[PDB]
Design a protein around this motif. Structure first.
Motif, short mmCIF file in Angstrom:
data_model
loop_
_atom_site.label_atom_id
_atom_site.label_comp_id
_atom_site.label_asym_id
_atom_site.label_seq_id
_atom_site.Cartn_x
_atom_site.Cartn_y
_atom_site.Cartn_z
N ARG A 7 0.75 -1.20 -0.13
CA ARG A 7 0.08 -0.02 0.17
C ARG A 7 0.91 1.32 -0.03
O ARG A 7 0.43 2.30 -0.77
CB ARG A 7 -0.90 0.14 1.31
CG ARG A 7 -2.06 -1.34 1.02
CD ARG A 7 -3.11 -0.94 2.09
NE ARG A 7 -3.95 0.51 1.73
CZ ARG A 7 -3.92 1.59 2.60
NH1 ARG A 7 -3.48 1.27 3.83
NH2 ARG A 7 -4.32 2.72 1.98
N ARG A 8 1.93 1.12 0.70
CA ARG A 8 2.78 2.41 0.86
C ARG A 8 3.66 2.54 -0.47
O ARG A 8 3.91 3.88 -0.96
CB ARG A 8 3.70 2.25 2.08
CG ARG A 8 4.56 1.15 1.96
CD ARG A 8 5.52 1.13 3.41
NE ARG A 8 6.74 0.20 3.08
CZ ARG A 8 7.71 0.23 2.40
NH1 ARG A 8 8.20 1.22 2.02
NH2 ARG A 8 8.73 -0.79 2.45
N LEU A 9 4.09 1.53 -0.98
CA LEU A 9 5.12 1.61 -2.06
C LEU A 9 4.18 2.26 -3.19
O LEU A 9 4.82 3.08 -3.95
CB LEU A 9 5.53 0.22 -2.64
CG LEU A 9 6.72 -0.03 -1.48
CD1 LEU A 9 7.20 -1.63 -1.69
CD2 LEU A 9 7.90 1.05 -1.57
N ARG A 10 2.83 1.80 -3.62
CA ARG A 10 2.09 2.24 -4.47
C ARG A 10 1.56 3.79 -4.31
O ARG A 10 1.63 4.49 -5.16
CB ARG A 10 0.77 1.24 -4.76
CG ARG A 10 1.19 0.13 -5.66
CD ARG A 10 1.18 0.40 -6.90
NE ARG A 10 1.58 -0.71 -7.73
CZ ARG A 10 1.51 -0.89 -9.03
NH1 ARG A 10 1.57 0.34 -9.94
NH2 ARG A 10 2.04 -1.85 -9.94
N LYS A 41 -12.10 -0.92 4.58
CA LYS A 41 -12.15 -0.43 3.10
C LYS A 41 -11.12 0.64 2.87
O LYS A 41 -11.01 1.16 1.70
CB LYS A 41 -13.66 0.13 3.09
CG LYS A 41 -13.84 0.40 1.59
CD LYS A 41 -15.18 0.88 1.53
CE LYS A 41 -15.59 1.07 0.04
NZ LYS A 41 -15.70 -0.30 -0.85
N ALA A 42 -10.48 1.29 3.90
CA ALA A 42 -9.53 2.41 3.70
C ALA A 42 -8.48 2.37 2.35
O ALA A 42 -8.34 3.07 1.69
CB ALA A 42 -8.43 2.23 4.96
N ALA A 43 -8.28 1.06 1.90
CA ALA A 43 -7.30 0.86 0.93
C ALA A 43 -8.33 1.24 -0.30
O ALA A 43 -7.51 1.94 -1.31
CB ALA A 43 -6.98 -0.50 0.71
N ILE A 46 -9.40 5.79 -0.35
CA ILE A 46 -8.42 6.67 -1.01
C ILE A 46 -8.56 6.67 -2.41
O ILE A 46 -8.75 7.76 -2.85
CB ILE A 46 -7.12 5.96 -0.69
CG1 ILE A 46 -6.71 6.17 0.71
CG2 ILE A 46 -6.03 7.05 -1.18
CD1 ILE A 46 -5.60 5.17 1.29
N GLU A 47 -9.08 5.69 -3.24
CA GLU A 47 -8.93 5.65 -4.73
C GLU A 47 -10.45 6.41 -4.93
O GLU A 47 -10.77 6.69 -6.21
CB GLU A 47 -9.12 4.21 -5.04
CG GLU A 47 -8.04 3.46 -4.59
CD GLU A 47 -6.58 4.13 -4.79
OE1 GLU A 47 -6.38 4.94 -4.28
OE2 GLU A 47 -5.94 3.61 -5.91
N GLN A 48 -11.38 6.49 -4.14
CA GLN A 48 -12.62 7.28 -4.49
C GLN A 48 -12.60 8.58 -4.71
O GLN A 48 -13.24 9.16 -5.63
CB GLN A 48 -13.65 7.00 -2.98
CG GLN A 48 -14.05 5.62 -2.88
CD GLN A 48 -15.09 5.48 -1.69
OE1 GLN A 48 -16.02 5.14 -1.97
NE2 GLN A 48 -14.67 5.78 -0.61
N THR A 49 -11.70 9.24 -4.19
CA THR A 49 -11.68 10.65 -4.11
C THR A 49 -10.41 10.78 -5.44
O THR A 49 -10.70 11.70 -6.22
CB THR A 49 -10.94 11.37 -3.02
OG1 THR A 49 -10.75 12.68 -3.12
CG2 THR A 49 -9.69 10.83 -2.51
N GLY A 55 -8.86 -1.35 -5.41
CA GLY A 55 -7.94 -2.43 -4.93
C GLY A 55 -6.58 -2.27 -5.62
O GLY A 55 -5.80 -2.98 -5.92
N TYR A 56 -6.26 -0.70 -6.15
CA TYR A 56 -4.97 -0.34 -6.83
C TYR A 56 -3.78 -0.87 -5.87
O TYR A 56 -2.93 -1.26 -6.19
CB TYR A 56 -4.96 1.04 -7.23
CG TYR A 56 -3.65 1.41 -8.00
CD1 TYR A 56 -3.76 0.91 -9.33
CD2 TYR A 56 -2.74 2.00 -7.42
CE1 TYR A 56 -2.30 1.33 -10.14
CE2 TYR A 56 -1.68 2.47 -8.14
CZ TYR A 56 -1.48 1.90 -9.54
OH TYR A 56 -0.30 2.23 -10.07
N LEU A 57 -4.21 -0.38 -4.73
CA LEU A 57 -2.91 -0.57 -3.57
C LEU A 57 -2.74 -1.86 -3.32
O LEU A 57 -1.50 -2.35 -2.85
CB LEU A 57 -3.39 0.31 -2.36
CG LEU A 57 -3.42 1.90 -2.78
CD1 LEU A 57 -4.31 2.48 -1.51
CD2 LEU A 57 -2.21 2.23 -2.51
N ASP A 58 -3.87 -2.73 -3.30
CA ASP A 58 -3.98 -4.02 -3.06
C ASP A 58 -2.91 -4.92 -3.91
O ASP A 58 -2.21 -5.77 -3.70
CB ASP A 58 -5.27 -4.93 -3.31
CG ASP A 58 -5.17 -5.90 -2.92
OD1 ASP A 58 -4.23 -6.90 -2.46
OD2 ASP A 58 -6.56 -6.75 -2.46
N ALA A 59 -2.75 -4.45 -5.30
CA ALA A 59 -1.77 -5.07 -6.30
C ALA A 59 -0.27 -5.27 -5.57
O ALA A 59 0.15 -4.39 -5.42
CB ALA A 59 -1.56 -4.29 -7.44
#
Length: 68
Positions: A7-10, A41-43, A46-49, A55-59
């Motif tokens: 999540r941090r690296l992305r 859902k926090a992951a 973020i992508e909502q705004t 799930g971009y961060l999930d990758a």
């Protein structure tokens, strides 16, 4: 589990050439810093705004077998 690592690296990659609002900067910095909370859902929140894909961060990359 090292999901927070992905999540941090992305997150920092996106903001490499972009900028974030102060209201979130305090929180976003934590994610990039490596110290933060994740599991809800926090992951995706973020992508909502930002408008990023779900799930971009999930990758994951490092979490995968054969990669350290």
């Amino acid at each position: 589990m090292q999901k927070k690592e992905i999540r941090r690296l992305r997150l920092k990659e996106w903001f490499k050439d972009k900028t974030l609002p102060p209201k979130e900067k305090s929180y976003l910095s934590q994610l990039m810093s490596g110290r933060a909370s994740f599991g809800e859902k926090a992951a995706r929140r973020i992508e909502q705004t930002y408008g990023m894909p779900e799930g971009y961060l999930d990758a994951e990359y490092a979490e995968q077998p054969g990669s350290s």
